[PDB]
Design a binder for this molecule. Structure first.
Ligand SMILES: *[C@H]1O[C@H](CO)[C@H](O)[C@H](O)[C@H]1NC(C)=O
Ligand SMILES: [Ca+2]
Ligand SMILES: [Ca+2]
Length: 229
């Protein structure tokens, strides 16, 4: 179906739903909570999602957002993701589950219905993932179906980075481009039929988790979807 929205900043959150530890702060979406001294709270997850459901049958979309990873040490955890799931998808487990999965089914593709582009700051040993920080496409599992190295210079840049995520409903391809000002660029694509996974309504949004020593912020976000008939 057709949907568009545009948040150049978040001084309005009229159509954003906050769950778990996410909240609106300083004109941004703050995905995990900080204490009254500004210190990242361990072992929390949060979601900030566009509140209106849409459908993926016969649909393409384009979305872009800007984000900042704020770290307070060289060992930040866990990262965040932009995700699509059903409208009643709740905040799930903190830590390396990124607010998207739970321990007993996190690698079981038959037990999950969620697609995401993840920005993963902590190399987990509890499941298979690369030995470096990485950006990944996830389809119904915390073990990414496509993954690439995310350079530490960019992770720790303090820069406002830009993501572009697009879904071609004809070819059934999900693509992320991530760019850093005077830094790295990243390209990831995967063939996946999102209408087959999600035959009814979905919501799109963000999920962040700690971990430790990290806070994730979304500074702007826009979206457009269009029919492919
Ligand atoms: C355990 O804690 C580290 C931080 O010390 C990371 O958050 C990691 O993701 C955690 N492991 C799991 C399985 O969540
Ligand atoms: Ca990962
Ligand atoms: Ca991880």
């Amino acid at each position: 179906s057709e949907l568009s929205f545009n948040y150049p900043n978040f001084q309005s959150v009229e159509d954003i739903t906050f769950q778990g530890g996410a909240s609106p702060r300083n004109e941004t979406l703050q995905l995990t909570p900080t204490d009254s001294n500004g210190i990242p709270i361990r072992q929390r997850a949060g979601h900030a999602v566009y509140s209106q459901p849409f459908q993926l049958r016969d649909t393409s979309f384009y979305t872009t957002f800007t984000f900042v990873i704020r770290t307070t040490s060289n060992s930040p955890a866990d990262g965040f993701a932009i995700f699509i799931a059903p409208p009643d998808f709740p905040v799930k487990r903190y830590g390396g589950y990124l607010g998207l999965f739970e321990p007993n089914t996190a690698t079981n593709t038959s037990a999950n219905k969620v697609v995401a582009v993840e920005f993963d700051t902590w190399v987990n040993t509890e499941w298979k993932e690369p030995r470096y920080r990485h950006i990944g496409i996830d389809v119904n599992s915390i073990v990414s179906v496509r993954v690439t190295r995310w350079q530490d210079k960019d992770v720790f840049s303090r820069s406002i980075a830009t993501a572009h995520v697009g879904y071609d409903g004809i070819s059934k391809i999900l693509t992320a481009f991530v760019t850093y000002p005077d830094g790295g660029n990243y390209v990831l694509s995967h063939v996946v039929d999102l209408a087959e996974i999600f035959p009814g309504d979905v919501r799109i949004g963000f999920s962040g988790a700690t971990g430790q020593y990290e806070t994730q912020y979304i500074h702007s976000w826009s979206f457009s979807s269009t029919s492919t008939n």
